[PDB]
């Protein structure tokens, strides 16, 4: 009942830039393997404990912000269920730790080597400490995103990443078929140790602020070309099918003999006898057909894309010959390339624009057949393993490799042209604490622009909203610099854009209500003559400095506190009279940023669209909570996520007349949900949620739910416990409609009832009095919130019913201790409807881990260490397991 408080630690995470995933193909070793070696660990450097876990994580949901979080704060690999870790004797997933059996279980003591293995064929993660296997694995976790190694630590540990050799030497032999994590390096980028989803980075002259990162999806490695299935290949194009083939064949043969290739039986550069030096009609059968289909696809790309070609000339083609070649092209057996004349024609700039698209398509088609055969990308080239470092489809390939594909495509296009035939996470908003609102005087703060992009700086009202971009409402006066604009309610241009480094001096003046923005020493001018950005501003509650860095953008806010540090203060602003926003402050101004973590908040009483009404229970109906869409006519309509503001914990196991001897001793509890007629049941989900549900999806379904399975067994198989962990237990409303009724709009309301047994953890659902065949099992000490996910298609959408059944102890008996044995439905004012909000404000810690987790690429692996302690005073809310 009372808000708790305690002293907790600061926990961070460090990951390498290695991402793996499961998709249609092109990124599939199926298995990966890496190790973490512990050098030294102080167990009790501080009062609470020392935190150190290793494991894997997901790139779409794992985002531990420093400070509070789920439970008692200090979130690392483990909590939030998007990561799977192992401390030294526990398998951390979801939020609860499950002990595991090991030969000599102990915490991560110094000189300990823990090896984690990831398998994507069957989704499973396994760990091995000091060679001995750990009798516990994860299973059946959804592969929506990419997987990367991660280690979580807090103030006192020192570990090393032994990835794959040449980036950290191994200590134990990996299981067969497992890559040593040193592939998938994405040769456009190098290897690094970086934090996960940071919003503040130390810089040369202060803390830089960082916007959302540009993360990679798991559907990026799969190559998809344009559709060329329906290509007629008319006779004029069909005739030039082989005619083009040997031209590229001989040109590639001479490009191969550039390094000195010769005709022979076995391909080895040291042996120098790769068979590649015959004519097209004399090529070996295996690759012949592949060459024909590639040469044809070269034409099918043009045909499918458009650019209707035509036979401009034929007489010139009949007289074209083969250019002379020196004796260097001659090789011992006797082969000689026959390159067609190429200088007789020149491609127009349109052809130079369109040639690279054909190379883009060709590389995708080339990769497609390779992944169809069973080839996957690998940093280390291995021909017997059916790999080479070129399966990245187009967009993440090194520019050194990119030139060969477009060279070959350009030669093919110029061969066609020579033979006649002419050819035709949204925004990270930074702010200041609301106690710094200014209602008098003149102020001046700067904002360096390290990178050029969508970044906005200005003055905003203290009641600024985080889910709306700056300038869309009357609560902000910012200056966009990507193109040059002033944003109060529109996008009127206000000068010139920035460059790589451009301090913007924003000054407000509340004496005559003006706002002026300056570039590096120059006052910005609007279109005609204004010399000021905004005038006659109605001063109300106050103004605060603001910043709106976009995705992949870095800025630097200098409010003040150091007049000498202000680069362009003396030039413009000082003489007119402008006190910097922080002058007589011995402590830096605390900033507040919009944290993109969806949390549940009560429905506002003045919501534009949704409305919740409480109705008392009559003699026939129980107390109810109705939801109505008050603007169903011509307004917004989108999915929404709701649950009731109170939970119910599961106890530890270690006519219509109700008779007392069963109702007063039962442990079942009931609540029902009624779907009004007209709202499609296929868009309604009814069930329960754990206090760690943070999915604000727009295409939600039962297949996008988070799930995992932890299996415990002895030292060979014989599993004992198989617990299924999730954060959403509901049943789709589209499974309770008869096939005959499906196909139109019905007129009978659908009622779904959910029963929870707090003594055995059994979960059942009934629809219209009919028991369903789906059930769930939960664990002791589990908090569940009655949740309904609905997509509105009506102005009468959904209605919660705190009903009752035959001695089933209505729901208002477990959430309240006073009414423990009261068999009467109730709805106290504390029990309300809470909706899911996309983003919310948050506080930036005054002092982060100032040691910055000192890491370096040492010879014996990548070492990361933390040394200084850090503590904060948490505030735990009991009903919702937050901190």
């Amino acid at each position: 009942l009372l808000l708790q408080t305690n002293l907790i630690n600061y926990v961070t995470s460090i990951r390498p830039n290695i991402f793996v995933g499961r998709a249609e193909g092109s990124t599939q070793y199926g298995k990966w393997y890496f190790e973490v070696m512990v050098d030294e660990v102080v167990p009790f450097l501080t009062a609470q404990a020392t935190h150190l876990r290793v494991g894997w994580a997901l790139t779409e949901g794992y985002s531990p912000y420093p400070g509070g979080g789920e439970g008692w704060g200090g979130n690392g690999v483990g909590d939030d269920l998007y990561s799977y870790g192992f401390d030294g004797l526990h398998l951390w997933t979801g939020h609860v730790a499950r002990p595991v059996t090991s030969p000599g279980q102990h915490l991560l003591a110094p000189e300990d080597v823990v090896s984690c293995c990831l398998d994507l064929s069957v989704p499973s993660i396994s760990f091995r400490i000091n060679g001995c296997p750990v009798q516990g694995v994860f299973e059946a976790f959804n592969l929506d995103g990419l997987f990367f190694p991660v280690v979580s630590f807090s103030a006192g540990v020192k570990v090393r990443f032994l990835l794959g050799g040449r980036h950290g030497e191994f200590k134990f032999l990996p299981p067969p078929g497992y890559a040593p994590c040193h592939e998938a390096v994405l040769p456009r980028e190098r290897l690094r140790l970086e934090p996960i989803k940071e919003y503040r980075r130390e810089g040369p002259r202060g803390p830089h602020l960082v916007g959302p990162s540009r993360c990679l999806s798991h559907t990026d490695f799969v190559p998809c070309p344009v559709d060329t299935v329906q290509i007629v290949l008319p006779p004029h194009l069909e005739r030039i099918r082989e005619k083009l083939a040997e031209n590229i064949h001989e040109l590639w043969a001479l490009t191969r003999i550039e390094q000195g290739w010769t005709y022979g039986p076995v391909r080895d550069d040291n042996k120098r006898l790769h068979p590649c030096l015959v004519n097209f009609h004399s090529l070996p059968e295996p690759e012949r057909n592949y060459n024909l289909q590639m040469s044809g696809e070269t034409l099918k790309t043009l045909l499918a894309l458009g650019c209707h070609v035509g036979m401009a000339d034929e007489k010139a083609e009949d007289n074209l010959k083969k250019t002379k070649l020196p004796k260097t092209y001659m090789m011992s057996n006797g082969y000689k390339p026959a390159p067609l004349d190429l200088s007789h024609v020149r491609l127009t700039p349109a052809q130079t624009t369109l040639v690279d698209r054909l190379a883009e398509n060709g590389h995708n088609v080339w990769a497609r057949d390779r992944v169809a055969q069973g080839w996957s990308y690998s940093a280390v080239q291995d021909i017997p393993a059916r790999r080479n470092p070129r399966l990245v489809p187009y967009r993440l390939l090194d520019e050194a490799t990119k030139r060969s594909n477009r060279d070959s495509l350009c030669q093919a296009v110029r061969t066609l042209l020579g033979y006649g035939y002419n050819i035709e996470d949204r925004v990270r908003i930074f702010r200041a604490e609301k106690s710094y609102t200014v209602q008098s005087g003149r102020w001046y703060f700067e904002f360096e622009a390290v990178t050029t992009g969508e970044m906005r700086v200005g003055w905003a009202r203290p009641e600024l909203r985080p889910d709306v971009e700056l300038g869309a409402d009357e609560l902000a006066y910012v200056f966009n610099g990507h193109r040059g604009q002033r944003w109060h309610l529109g996008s009127e241009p206000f000068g010139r854009p920035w460059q790589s480094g451009d301090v913007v001096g924003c000054m407000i003046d509340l004496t005559e209500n003006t706002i002026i923005f300056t570039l590096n020493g120059e006052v910005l001018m609007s279109d005609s003559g204004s010399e000021t950005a905004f005038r006659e501003i109605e001063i109300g509650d106050g103004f605060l400095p603001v910043c709106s860095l976009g995705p992949g953008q870095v800025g630097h806010l200098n409010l003040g506190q150091d007049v000498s540090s202000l680069r362009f203060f003396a030039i413009c602003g000082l003489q007119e009279g402008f006190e910097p926003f922080a002058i007589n402050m011995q402590r830096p101004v605390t900033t507040w940023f919009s944290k993109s973590l969806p949390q549940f908040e009560p429905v506002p009483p003045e919501h534009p669209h949704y409305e919740v009404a409480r109705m008392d229970g009559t003699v026939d109906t129980p107390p109810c909570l109705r939801l109505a869409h008050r603007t169903w006519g011509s307004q917004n309509s989108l999915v929404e996520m709701l649950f009731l503001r109170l939970s119910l914990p599961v106890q530890f196991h270690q006519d219509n007349r109700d008779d007392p001897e069963i109702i007063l001793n039962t442990t079942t509890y009931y609540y029902s949900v009624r779907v009004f007629a007209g709202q499609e049941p296929s868009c309604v989900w009814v069930g329960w949620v754990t206090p760690d549900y943070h999915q604000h999806d727009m295409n939600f379904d039962l297949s996008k739910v988070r799930a995992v399975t932890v299996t415990m067994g002895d030292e060979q198989g014989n599993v004992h416990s198989s617990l299924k962990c999730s954060n959403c237990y509901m049943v789709w409303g589209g499974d309770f409609v008869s096939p005959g009724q499906q196909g139109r709009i019905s007129h009978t309301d659908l009622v779904i009832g959910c029963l929870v047994d707090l003594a055995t953890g059994l979960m059942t659902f009934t629809a219209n009095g009919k028991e369903s065949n789906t059930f769930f099992q939960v664990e002791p000490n589990t908090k569940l919130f009655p949740a309904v996910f609905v997509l509105p298609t009506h102005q009468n959408v959904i209605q919660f019913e705190l009903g009752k059944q035959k001695n089933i102890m209505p729901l208002s008996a477990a959430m309240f201790l006073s009414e423990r044995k009261n068999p009467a439905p109730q709805c106290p004012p504390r029990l309300e409807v809470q909706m899911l909000m996309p983003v919310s404000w948050s506080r930036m810690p005054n002092h982060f881990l100032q040691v910055e987790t000192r890491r370096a690429g040492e010879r014996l692996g990548w070492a990361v260490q933390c040394q200084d302690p850090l503590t904060m005073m948490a505030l735990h809310i009991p009903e919702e397991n937050r901190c």
């Binding site: 001018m525 007049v563 003396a570 000082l574 003489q575 002058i583």
Partner: protein, 141 residues
């Protein structure tokens, strides 16, 4: 000086307005009824920070005193004499919190601080800026 010569005479303003309307000079393209677009006024507005820089923030206390003295159609000589008669009213560096960083900025980055002691130069550098600030007020009003 040219600005105050223009201000303390009606014929100068009349002739400038007549010249502008007769030649139809834009008077806005140079700076990239139409008093706010006047050439002299814009030039003085651009050059005013030069004059403000040479004045110490301590002279801000005597700025209003000089303005009040000039409010009675006073001359430069009598204003300078009156200022020198009570040149001890400036200062209050320790009496206010907003003056500490101003003095620090004045002392730190620039070069020589006017030899740090020149009673004769103080009134000379205060009178001109006070007259300019006074004459600038009527243009906006």
């Amino acid at each position: 000086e040219i600005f105050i010569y223009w201000s303390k005479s009606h014929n100068f303003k009349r002739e400038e307005q007549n010249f502008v309307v007769q030649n139809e000079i834009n008077n806005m393209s140079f700076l990239t009824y139409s008093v706010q677009t006047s050439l002299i006024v814009a030039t003085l507005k651009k050059m005013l920070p030069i004059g403000l820089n040479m004045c110490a923030p301590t002279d801000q206390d005597l700025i209003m005193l000089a303005k009040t003295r000039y409010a009675l159609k006073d001359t430069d000589e009598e204003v300078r004499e009156f200022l020198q008669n009570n040149l001890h009213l400036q200062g209050k560096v320790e009496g206010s919190p907003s003056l500490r960083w101003q003095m620090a900025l004045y002392r730190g980055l620039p070069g020589r601080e006017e030899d740090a002691d020149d009673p004769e130069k103080i009134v000379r550098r205060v009178q001109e800026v006070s007259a300019v600030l006074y004459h600038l007020e009527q243009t906006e009003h």
